[PDB]
């Protein structure tokens, strides 16, 4: 489609984005398909087409919603969910409906043996490629370097991605996308203290027991925090599929670079993605001659 047109479902042609008037009328609410702190998502109908309708849950988080919509329009690409309509005045927008839900429910989807054949390594590794391909485009976005902040644990990280009906990974929940400027200082992912090993080590309070947490005193980090969580996401996406034991071997060294304690030594998302594509191709040639 042209830049701001869309063709979803059984559409024969692309339509320009729906604006506030047609959304209030032509978009009818059906079934809630997703909750969240920032949003409520309803499966909906617009002109015989199934669609996704995201509303602002609580007025408390109006700013997060509007910027997530601001970034959603800014980063419409092959790596992000397809936008359908925008009406920020009503704090609401419309995107393409993906019936497989989030990639959080991946193993349940591949359990359905209408999707058993796709429970292969070339599908799961492609999803990981799409994941790193998104992160590569994120850190080099037209809106400057951006950081996927809403990713403190593994499951919340997966909840921000969708599974298109052809086993492709798409980003969706872009409410928290700060920009890393080339000036310095960096960014922070929230106004409260983060903990755990799933977040990057620089995302932790570095002062210990004597100094209690304080938002102004947190130094600040960059996009390498996304590199940090790539193996844990990659480990989930491959699961234990036939062949993934060989793939993790090939990716061990690039796994070990993403998990470096010093962030400036971690590989860029384009460095990670290139290894992922080359391993995919190598095992595609290894399978061919058998
Ligand atoms: C309100 C605010 O602080 N927005 C800033 C924003 O913050 C993000 C933050 O970047 C990340 C920290 O990782 O976390 C966001 O909140 C998460 C939270 O981490 C958990 O995953 C989870 O928490 C809840 C809490 C309540 C509910 C409710 C009742 C209902 C429900 O169904 O789910 C939850 C889950 O989910 C939230 C959101 O996904 C935090 N965002 C929010 C809305 O709190 O970061 C940007 C730039 O990064 C600015 O700092 C914002 O000001
Ligand atoms: N287009 C969509 N198609 C199908 N499922 C969706 C779509 N958008 C959201 N979902 C579901 O809504 C959930 C919450 O979406 P999200 O953007 O992350 O809300 P929030 O910002 O409140 O956390 C997703 O994890 C997912 O299950
Ligand atoms: Mg979410
Ligand atoms: Mg959100």
Author numbering: 53 to 342
Which lines from the publication concern this structure?
The mannose is then phosphorylated by POMK at the C6 hydroxyl position, to allow further glycan elongation by enzymes including Fukutin, FKRP, TMEM5, B4GAT1, and LARGE. POMK mutations cause a spectrum of congenital and limb-girdle muscular dystrophies, including the most severe presentation known as the Walker-Warburg syndrome, which is associated with brain and eye abnormalities and death in early childhood. Despite compelling biochemical evidence in support of the kinase activity of POMK, its catalytic mechanism was puzzling, since it was long considered a pseudokinase.
The critical role of this Lys in DrPOMK is instead served by Lys91DrPOMK located at the beginning of strand β2 that reaches into the active site and interacts with the phosphate groups of ADP. In POMK, the MCD Cys (Cys201DrPOMK) forms a disulfide bridge with the Cys in the activation segment (Cys241DrPOMK). A DLD motif is present in POMKs, and the first Asp (Asp225DrPOMK) adopts a similar position as Asp184PKA. The trisaccharide is nestled in a groove next to the nucleotide-binding pocket. The planar AlF3 group is sandwiched between the β-phosphate of ADP and the Man, and is 1.9 Å from both the ADP donor oxygen and Man-O6, mimicking the catalytic transition state.
